[PDB]
Design an enzyme around this catalytic site. Structure first.
Site, PDB file in Angstrom:
ATOM      1  N   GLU A  63     -40.662  -6.687 -18.055  1.00 38.59           N
ATOM      2  CA  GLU A  63     -39.811  -5.495 -18.190  1.00 38.59           C
ATOM      3  C   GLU A  63     -40.688  -4.294 -18.009  1.00 38.59           C
ATOM      4  OE1 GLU A  63     -36.345  -5.891 -20.106  1.00 38.59           O
ATOM      5  OE2 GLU A  63     -36.010  -4.453 -18.832  1.00 38.59           O
ATOM      6  N   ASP A  75     -35.181  -5.971 -15.994  1.00 37.37           N
ATOM      7  CA  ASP A  75     -35.649  -5.663 -14.600  1.00 37.37           C
ATOM      8  C   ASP A  75     -36.884  -6.132 -13.808  1.00 37.37           C
ATOM      9  OD1 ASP A  75     -37.739  -4.390 -16.234  1.00 37.37           O
ATOM     10  OD2 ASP A  75     -37.702  -2.543 -15.354  1.00 37.37           O
ATOM     11  N   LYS A 133     -40.783  -0.073 -18.528  1.00 33.83           N
ATOM     12  CA  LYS A 133     -39.923   1.312 -18.975  1.00 33.83           C
ATOM     13  C   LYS A 133     -40.594   2.450 -18.964  1.00 33.83           C
ATOM     14  CE  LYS A 133     -36.318  -1.019 -20.568  1.00 33.83           C
ATOM     15  NZ  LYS A 133     -35.843  -1.047 -22.074  1.00 33.83           N
TER      16      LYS A 133
END
Lengths: 261, 261
Positions: free
Chosen positions: B95, B75, B97
């Site tokens: 990334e 992402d 999360k």
DNA sequence: TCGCGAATTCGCG
DNA sequence: TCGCGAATTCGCG
């Protein structure tokens, strides 16, 4: 099979033993083939143990621990053997995962989806969690020359061949294994560096690009590409094979017991 | 900050840029600091590319591919720089999360659970999937001496300090970070071999137990232990720092461009 | 108690 | 189309 391995295999077949129970059967077969050696079975390993193994390699490693009672629990467990120095060396670590219930849905007249009209369900990604325990065991065995980690896969998301499923209506739903809508086998290939699946990758390989030298820890990734359930007899043979390979690598630290006993 | 890094940081702060947009901002800052070099941004990498990188290291590696169009999509994306040989070398992989919405549930009068009476929700394990992309990038950069993988964490499941949340009723729910009911930070520590979190672990470490030599690829794991949202300004500074470190390691293969230009 | 694990449905280009 | 990603609720000793 060789000696009692055929006997033990049929026993697992008769009782349809789970991966955890097969690991216990393997250590029982190992103690039978090697009476001079001592084997044990564990169901988990604390993060404290892994951190301690890391510190022995480098003082800067294994320094974090937020939850004191943290641990990993492979559904297959861990098998170990005591070496000549009194230390327990891991011989086997098994795990079995499932994903994709399309075969079952098609056997019945169940249409999935947000509208209840789809024959197949878009495959998820929950299987990617498998990489965590593989990393933990790798760190725990960073000083070793073998990595006896076995992963068994089964379900609609782990096909290696085309299959046809007939519904109660009579219509045959043809499933192509190479379809990215179901196949999630590629979400695991990083665990063994792209080496062939359904193979014993226990002995660590040593590579290098420049004058560097690196040790690879490849996990053995087995799958039931048919979409059927795993056969306990063959699971036993596969796990026993990897266990014996671990003993070959550990050979130098087991001599005094096989001799002076 | 040093030069324009302070300007770019305030821009990210003003727009509350996502991790992916910050990566684009980083490459923009890199092209500004190093006009002689060429940088690019990608949103994904095909499994074919990773397999090809693996074959260059060892012919037996990168031999599996069940779904031809397989790929990974961080992402945050990927940033790269062209070396003196014309090859693109990865400088950054970000990334971000999320997991644990207890802070939000407590801010409101929402009681979770199967009975609707619990103040907290038993923390899940979906974050363990993070290990997959880390393995992929590691294999893709197995020939490199640096591993610029950054992972940003936030939520009720990634606390590093105790906090108190007041509900509409007035009752204060005290959350202890060291509680295994919420904390899932230990489910990621394997990614960096237990090395300190919130640190730049880009430069690969070389260890060994016996005369062997192994290269460790530790990921930088950053977390917002407050339970608050990440600040885009600091995310930018962290990512830019790791990117510049990657350039230092790549220094030898960038000289001809910084000089002969 | 506390802490790990199952593996899911469906949105998004 | 096809293929990757979000990260969840709750059972189990």
């Amino acid at each position: 099979s060789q000696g009692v391995i055929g006997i033990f295999g049929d026993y697992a077949k008769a009782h349809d033993l789970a991966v955890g129970e097969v690991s216990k059967l393997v250590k029982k077969a190992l103690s039978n083939e090697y009476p001079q050696l001592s084997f044990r079975y564990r169901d988990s390993i604390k993060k404290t143990e892994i951190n301690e193994a890391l510190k022995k390699i480098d003082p800067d490693l294994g320094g974090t621990l937020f939850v004191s009672n943290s641990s990993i629990k492979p559904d297959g467990g861990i098998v170990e053997v005591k070496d000549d120095y009194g230390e327990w060396r891991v011989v086997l670590v098994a795990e079995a995962k499932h994903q994709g219930k399309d075969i079952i849905n098609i056997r019945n007249g169940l249409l999935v989806g947000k509208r209840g009209d789809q024959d197949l369900m878009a495959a998820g990604n929950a299987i990617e969690r498998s990489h965590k325990n593989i990393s933990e065991i790798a760190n725990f065995m960073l000083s070793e020359s073998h990595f006896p980690y076995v992963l068994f896969l089964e379900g609609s998301n782990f096909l290696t061949e085309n299959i046809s499923i007939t519904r109660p209506d009579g219509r045959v739903v043809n499933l192509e294994y190479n379809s990215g809508i179901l196949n999630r086998l590629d979400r695991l290939t990083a665990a063994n560096y792209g080496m062939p699946i359904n193979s014993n990758l226990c002995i660590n390989k040593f590579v290098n690009h420049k004058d560097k030298s690196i040790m690879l820890q490849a996990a053995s990734i087995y799958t039931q590409g048919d979409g059927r359930e795993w056969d306990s007899k063959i699971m036993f043979e596969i796990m026993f094979d990897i266990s014996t390979t671990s003993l070959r690598v550990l050979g130098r630290d087991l001599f005094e017991q096989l001799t002076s006993k």
